[PDB]
Amino acid sequence: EKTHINIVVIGHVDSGKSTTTGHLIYKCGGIDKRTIEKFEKEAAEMGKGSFKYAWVLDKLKAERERGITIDISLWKFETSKYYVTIIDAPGHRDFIKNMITGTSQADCAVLIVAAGVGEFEAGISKNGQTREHALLAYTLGVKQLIVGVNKMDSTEPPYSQKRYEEIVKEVSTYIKKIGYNPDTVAFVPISGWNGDNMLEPSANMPWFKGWKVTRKDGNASGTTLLEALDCILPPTRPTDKPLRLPLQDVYKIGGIGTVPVGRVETGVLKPGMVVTFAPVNVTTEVKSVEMHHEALSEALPGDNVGFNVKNVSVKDVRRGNVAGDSKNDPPMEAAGFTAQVIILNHPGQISAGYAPVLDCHTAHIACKFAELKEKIDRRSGKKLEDGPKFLKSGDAAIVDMVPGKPMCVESFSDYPPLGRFAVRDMRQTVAVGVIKAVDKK
Amino acid sequence: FPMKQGVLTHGRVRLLLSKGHSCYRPRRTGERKRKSVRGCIVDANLSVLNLVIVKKGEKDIPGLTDTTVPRRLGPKRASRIRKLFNLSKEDDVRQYVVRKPLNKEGKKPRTKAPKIQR
Amino acid sequence: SGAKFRISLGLPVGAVINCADNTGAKNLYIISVKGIKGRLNRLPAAGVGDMVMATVKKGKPELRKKVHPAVVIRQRKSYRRKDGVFLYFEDNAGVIVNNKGEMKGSAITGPVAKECADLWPRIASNAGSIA
RNA sequence: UACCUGGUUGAUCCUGCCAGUAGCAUAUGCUUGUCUCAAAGAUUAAGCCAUGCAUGUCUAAGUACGCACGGCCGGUACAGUGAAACUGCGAAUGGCUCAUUAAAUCAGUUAUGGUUCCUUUGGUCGCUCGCCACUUGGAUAACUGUGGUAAUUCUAGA
RNA sequence: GGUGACCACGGGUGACGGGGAAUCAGGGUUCGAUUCCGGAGAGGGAGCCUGAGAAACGGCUACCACAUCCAAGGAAGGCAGCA
RNA sequence: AAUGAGUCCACUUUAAAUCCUUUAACGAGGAUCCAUUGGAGGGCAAGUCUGGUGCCAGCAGCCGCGGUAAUUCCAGCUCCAA
RNA sequence: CGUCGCUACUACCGAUUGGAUGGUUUAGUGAGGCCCUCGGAUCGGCCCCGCCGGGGUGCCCUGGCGGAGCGCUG
RNA sequence: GUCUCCGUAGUGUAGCGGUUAUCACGUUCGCCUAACACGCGAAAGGUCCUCGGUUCGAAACCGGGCGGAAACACCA
Ligand SMILES: [Mg+2]
Ligand SMILES: [Mg+2]
Ligand SMILES: [Mg+2]
Ligand SMILES: [Mg+2]
Ligand SMILES: [Mg+2]
Ligand SMILES: [Mg+2]
Ligand SMILES: [Mg+2]
Ligand SMILES: [Mg+2]
Ligand SMILES: [Mg+2]
């Protein structure tokens, strides 16, 4: 055998991300009936009954009390074609750094779109996140995604054809501008809470014939979301490149010590081989490797793996570092790096010096412009002007960067998933950039 | 939880079970372990009930009173075969033992007899 | 949903009840009961499942000279449970919570009345047994 | 290697301490090419522990009708190799740590004519007058079958 | 009655005892958790079966403190052994 | 001219390896294949050198040095001890 | 040389029938094991003996159903 | 992770949606003295932690993010 991929569910708040994910898990042999029965018992006890499927991933007390997805959670379910682990995005502007973290370690994306009256329009708006999630998925490097339309029973009248066609049209008209091809993007009308059109073809909505995709590699046409999950093309895994591990989270488990967990971007991880962490510059030897309560001898790229490094505390290595092989070339601190940012939506003028938060791979650290070298056209790296005084939305530019807090970044040519980054300010997306050059220490 | 004879209650109790009482085999010599046992009085709250027919009825129960399975292996003691075959004293005791005929496909057929004792 | 029926209160203002959680407090001195409008000369009284304002008289010194929200979990006064059952407990006991209902502590010693368990889910989770 | 030196005063003899000086024993800093030995979670927490292992055992010489193999030499209780299990022995040694403990432990000395002792070794085992002995009775393992519990090195009935 | 200024009794110990170690004119002063001998303990106490030998804890029973699984009816714990 | 420290075949060692000792073949002229740690007023071996600082920064176990010509600080050079 | 005034630091007294953490114990309650005195859920033997039976010759050598002697026993 | 509060000259830190100011110093600083010291004179000194929104314009009205300062949770 089985191949490993990663999927992230992105969408709007209250559009049904965690409930849909939990019910997809339950239908695909995730957890037995009585565990979810106890979950529903608890959900009825406090009051939030419809959030019972959301509880399979939203395990924290604060998330369960507020009924709000705060942090990224993992769960595994084996499908017809291959293994898959799902990234549950929060879906809030308050925790946008969290979903940037989550979206980075995912190969595909499921764009959950609400269909009920009012919720869809509120999602697609200046304060909405359905624009933001799709834009940042394209920014961080997720090529193939799928758009799923949820809450078919909520809309009036239930299971409407006109509603679904309008949703598909309105999603397509903007996803063309973002970059994804709706001909390659599969559109699936689903209902997670009811459990409609997910594992078996529906009976409440016979009007839906079936989605189709037109890719170069292979053409697919399924009826349910599971058939769409299987038809996702396998990613190109760069196994020969030197190993890199953007760190997701740190845990201190009783008796096995501190186990960093992160996605394998390049290289292969194996027990008994010394690793270095770029930002804190600490050397340590790997004891063992596992994944989803199962051990591994070889950790292939694009795998969420948990490995036990020896004699490093929980505080020394924290969220956002990059791990790598000590024998091969290591990730080193980036005192400065020349980045190619394209300004998307910034009201005020851009001068050299304002400090937005720049998120490279998993972590988020603000950085300051030192000087703007060249004003560059919107594509192809075509030079337009030398040394611009200020920058404005709707333009690309090569820029040299000096982070305030220490950070490690890698070029887009050496490791393509490392090179992707986004820029955030004004509580919005201000620029999209990739790194081409970087200075080490 | 199995039931134990002599508990004289309905429900479950905890008993310090020694060697050879019931519901317990000792791991090491002299070990006694406290265990939960159901009382001897039977009521509604049971999974199974063991019942052993003492006297035959008027007709035959299907699948129970038919196709009498034999006891596997005969008596091994010399006196225990003398009782079973009414031997007086040393009358072909060697050849009056029960011989077990075993047959398997690849096996070349053979009879089996026990090492008779005493 | 379902609302709590009326029960015999038997714990007026000034009653000292046991503190059944592991907060380090030994008793709770009830100073008022939540949701009591009142009546001339009538003492505000509480039954099981009632939120009260209480001060601990003996216990850890960092809890003593303060006012805490508490919930009564056991009472000695007999009360009817709508099925002809008159139930009473060995002692009057309550636990310290906040205004949102979750306990300051993490464990409860002894049983918890079913009325309190049904009305406060966070108390019911830490309840060892429900009577 | 039985050793001193600087500092109270304008200067001098003292008292006297401070400081210097050398070793070892813990930690730490910097540095480190070879080779032989070699300590190593004692000091604080005898604080808490995931996981895995650390105590099992058969000779000709107690009990084999498991086919689980197999010589049969073919008219025979048991050839033999042997799983499992019963029985016997071991598991009270070793290893770890130093919390408790101030005539207590412990060291040397002496006694048990005031005691027990698996095993080994050596004695003793016709010393007793008193209708199976050419060998007595019953049960239970392993084994077959029917199960119960979410679960255990849990077990029941036949 | 018995014991005490020939220091009882009580308290402290950052006390396991000893063989020994450091220092080294002689005399001494400190250190001995640590591989050999003896003792004690197995999270804290307590009580027992078996056995020649245990108040055993890689045996059991109960309480206390921690703490594992659970379908919440129960079940299972003891690294001051090697890692 | 002579050698190792290293690369490295084989033997040997060993339960099996490793290491040591043997032994092929490469392996040194800044032999750049680079010795460090603390000091240079006294105690206490070693500079009344030069450039900065100016009772500041700092040094200094103790006496003490530093307030614009520092044998004592920060450095270069040169010396001292192991 | 001392008071007084300012600034630090260190201890002391001090209402608060102060507070916290250990240790040893009185008293009350008291799990569990062990011992004794009972107890008797069950499991076996003898008396079996309603009988067919019976051989040294109704007088049984007993090869079994069966009641149960409704006692004596372990 | 989740909440609660604090975060303005170098400190002391008032504040007002039309103004971050002053104060005590600390320093600088003419000012003496060989040097002190003693006085004498003046000054500087603020992104209101920080970035935003609101707003005719806000440190402060609102929100974030960052630190601290408290809890509360956090077991492949
Ligand atoms: Mg025999
Ligand atoms: Mg009145
Ligand atoms: Mg014996
Ligand atoms: Mg001690
Ligand atoms: Mg010792
Ligand atoms: Mg010893
Ligand atoms: Mg012991
Ligand atoms: Mg014990
Ligand atoms: Mg010098």
Side-chain angles (χ1 to χ4, degrees), chain A residues 2-441, chain B, chain C:
Chain A
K2 308 165 191 162
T3 59
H4 193 280
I5 62 153
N6 294 74
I7 280 178
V8 55
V9 175
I10 50 170
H12 192 51
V13 55
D14 305 339
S15 68
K17 296 183 290 294
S18 302
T19 304
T20 290
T21 297
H23 188 193
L24 173 61
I25 288 154
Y26 175 66
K27 297 184 290 294
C28 301
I31 60 171
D32 66 331
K33 195 176 169 189
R34 302 214 87 190
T35 302
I36 190 167
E37 193 178 317
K38 167 196 153 191
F39 271 50
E40 185 185 36
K41 193 164 61 56
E42 292 178 322
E45 284 183 30
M46 65 182 179
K48 280 74 176 175
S50 302
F51 288 69
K52 56 168 182 167
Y53 296 115
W55 270 40
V56 190
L57 294 93
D58 299 15
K59 279 202 78 192
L60 270 63
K61 181 267 290 180
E63 293 177 316
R64 287 179 173 182
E65 194 78 55
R66 286 259 287 284
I68 296 166
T69 307
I70 294 168
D71 195 43
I72 295 278
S73 292
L74 288 166
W75 194 288
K76 66 143 198 173
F77 58 96
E78 192 192 320
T79 62
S80 299
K81 196 168 169 68
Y82 64 83
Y83 182 94
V84 57
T85 187
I86 191 166
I87 301 299
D88 187 33
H92 290 260
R93 298 292 297 273
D94 291 331
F95 324 118
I96 172 170
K97 69 182 192 173
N98 296 47
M99 61 79 70
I100 282 161
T101 290
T103 297
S104 66
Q105 47 171 41
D107 297 315
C108 186
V110 178
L111 190 55
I112 296 295
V113 174
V117 289
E119 192 161 58
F120 178 56
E121 278 77 50
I124 192 66
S125 296
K126 190 170 184 292
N127 311 129
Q129 288 70 241
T130 313
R131 295 179 192 169
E132 183 65 24
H133 282 229
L135 166 60
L136 280 69
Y138 205 74
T139 299
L140 291 165
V142 175
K143 185 182 174 181
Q144 192 177 4
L145 61 82
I146 190 167
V147 176
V149 194
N150 201 1
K151 309 191 178 192
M152 294 296 172
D153 81 2
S154 77
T155 194
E156 194 73 18
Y159 307 110
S160 165
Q161 184 167 15
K162 294 175 172 290
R163 185 63 168 183
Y164 174 65
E165 290 171 2
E166 179 172 29
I167 291 153
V168 175
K169 198 191 201 81
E170 183 55 39
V171 169
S172 171
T173 52
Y174 181 76
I175 191 167
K176 270 194 177 192
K177 294 182 174 181
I178 292 301
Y180 305 96
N181 197 331
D183 298 312
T184 61
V185 166
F187 285 89
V188 176
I190 49 167
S191 188
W193 196 78
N194 196 240
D196 178 1
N197 219 15
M198 270 282 185
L199 187 153
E200 50 183 32
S202 174
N204 293 319
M205 65 182 179
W207 52 266
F208 183 66
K209 184 178 184 293
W211 54 267
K212 200 168 191 174
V213 303
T214 56
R215 319 152 197 162
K216 296 183 290 294
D217 291 331
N219 303 7
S221 57
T223 52
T224 61
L225 187 152
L226 183 63
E227 292 180 334
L229 180 148
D230 294 309
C231 65
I232 295 160
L233 301 163
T236 58
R237 301 294 183 185
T239 187
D240 61 356
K241 337 283 188 296
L243 187 153
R244 287 279 187 284
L245 312 161
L247 187 153
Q248 178 40 91
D249 290 330
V250 298
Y251 316 123
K252 189 161 75 74
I253 311 94
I256 201 78
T258 61
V259 171
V261 180
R263 183 178 181 270
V264 178
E265 183 178 1
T266 55
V268 181
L269 196 74
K270 294 180 176 67
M273 182 277 287
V274 63
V275 290
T276 62
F277 305 96
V280 298
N281 203 4
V282 180
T283 175
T284 187
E285 201 183 318
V286 179
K287 281 191 179 277
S288 44
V289 175
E290 295 180 354
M291 66 181 180
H292 293 112
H293 313 253
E294 294 185 38
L296 294 167
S297 58
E298 301 190 327
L300 302 172
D303 198 348
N304 292 21
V305 295
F307 60 103
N308 176 221
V309 285
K310 171 160 207 161
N311 297 339
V312 287
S313 186
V314 69
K315 293 182 183 293
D316 295 25
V317 174
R318 297 292 299 274
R319 175 164 174 175
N321 312 143
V322 178
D325 178 40
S326 188
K327 295 286 188 179
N328 300 346
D329 51 13
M332 189 87 228
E333 183 178 1
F337 52 95
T338 311
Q340 193 176 242
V341 292
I342 317 173
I343 319 305
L344 299 186
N345 187 229
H346 193 252
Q349 71 182 235
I350 294 171
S351 311
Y354 64 92
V357 57
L358 277 82
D359 52 274
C360 194
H361 48 81
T362 300
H364 294 88
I365 299 298
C367 302
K368 302 143 194 172
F369 285 101
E371 57 165 32
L372 324 179
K373 275 305 304 213
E374 296 169 13
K375 186 182 171 190
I376 307 189
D377 202 55
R378 215 187 205 81
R379 54 198 322 154
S380 192
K382 195 173 171 182
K383 189 166 175 158
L384 187 66
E385 195 180 351
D386 291 331
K389 184 37 72 152
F390 60 106
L391 281 168
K392 181 51 57 143
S393 184
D395 178 56
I398 193 66
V399 289
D400 207 327
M401 295 299 291
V402 180
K405 213 166 183 176
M407 199 66 216
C408 167
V409 300
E410 293 83 3
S411 59
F412 187 58
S413 58
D414 287 32
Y415 320 103
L418 292 174
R420 306 307 207 86
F421 78 84
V423 193
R424 297 196 288 101
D425 191 50
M426 184 177 176
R427 207 157 182 163
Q428 286 189 334
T429 305
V430 291
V432 163
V434 292
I435 315 181
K436 289 194 162 185
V438 64
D439 174 43
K440 307 312 199 311
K441 185 176 180 180
Chain B
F1 294 98
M3 63 180 71
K4 192 160 165 44
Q5 173 80 257
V7 180
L8 301 196
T9 197
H10 54 285
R12 219 181 304 130
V13 304
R14 309 195 51 94
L15 293 186
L16 189 68
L17 300 181
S18 66
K19 175 184 178 181
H21 275 194
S22 187
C23 304
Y24 177 74
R25 66 169 187 84
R27 282 317 165 280
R28 54 186 296 148
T29 302
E31 176 181 358
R32 328 175 299 188
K33 186 173 282 188
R34 194 162 305 257
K35 293 180 74 67
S36 296
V37 287
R38 170 67 172 83
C40 59
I41 295 90
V42 59
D43 61 356
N45 297 115
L46 282 72
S47 294
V48 297
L49 182 50
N50 296 114
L51 302 163
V52 174
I53 297 93
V54 183
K55 70 188 292 182
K56 185 68 184 311
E58 70 269 12
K59 66 94 175 179
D60 273 7
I61 300 298
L64 189 152
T65 70
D66 48 351
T67 74
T68 300
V69 286
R71 53 189 66 185
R72 186 185 300 112
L73 72 165
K76 192 188 192 300
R77 193 180 292 167
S79 296
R80 284 189 179 275
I81 69 167
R82 285 201 279 263
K83 308 167 165 237
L84 191 150
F85 279 156
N86 291 138
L87 276 299
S88 66
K89 276 301 285 291
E90 210 57 45
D91 293 328
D92 197 23
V93 184
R94 277 85 178 276
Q95 284 283 76
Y96 287 169
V97 76
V98 187
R99 303 207 64 99
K100 183 185 184 77
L102 73 164
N103 289 336
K104 278 166 305 299
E105 301 72 17
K107 180 178 181 292
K108 188 267 185 181
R110 185 202 310 258
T111 175
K112 202 169 208 180
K115 178 177 171 66
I116 186 168
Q117 278 284 340
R118 265 166 75 171
Chain C
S1 192
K4 189 180 78 170
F5 297 102
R6 199 212 65 99
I7 73 171
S8 284
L9 304 179
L11 288 175
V13 163
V16 167
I17 71 184
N18 286 309
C19 199
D21 51 4
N22 55 354
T23 51
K26 305 286 108 176
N27 51 21
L28 296 161
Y29 167 80
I30 298 171
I31 73 170
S32 68
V33 189
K34 273 278 183 187
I36 294 282
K37 273 83 169 177
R39 174 64 174 84
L40 189 73
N41 300 305
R42 183 167 299 156
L43 303 188
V48 293
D50 278 326
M51 183 161 264
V52 301
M53 295 291 134
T55 80
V56 302
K57 291 308 198 170
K58 69 179 51 169
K60 287 179 179 178
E62 69 273 16
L63 310 164
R64 287 193 67 253
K65 305 171 66 88
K66 295 190 295 181
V67 174
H68 300 285
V71 174
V72 182
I73 64 148
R74 292 195 298 269
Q75 77 179 8
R76 269 184 56 71
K77 174 62 175 185
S78 285
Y79 67 96
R80 218 175 157 270
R81 187 177 286 172
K82 281 291 186 292
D83 58 356
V85 163
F86 273 91
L87 175 82
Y88 67 112
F89 293 85
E90 188 172 49
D91 66 327
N92 315 298
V95 302
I96 291 180
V97 301
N98 52 8
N99 59 5
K100 293 183 183 293
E102 55 287 358
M103 305 166 66
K104 165 172 284 214
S106 56
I108 302 172
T109 62
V112 172
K114 195 183 174 251
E115 299 294 328
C116 178
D118 296 350
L119 186 61
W120 308 94
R122 297 284 58 90
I123 304 196
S125 56
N126 310 319
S129 82
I130 295 91

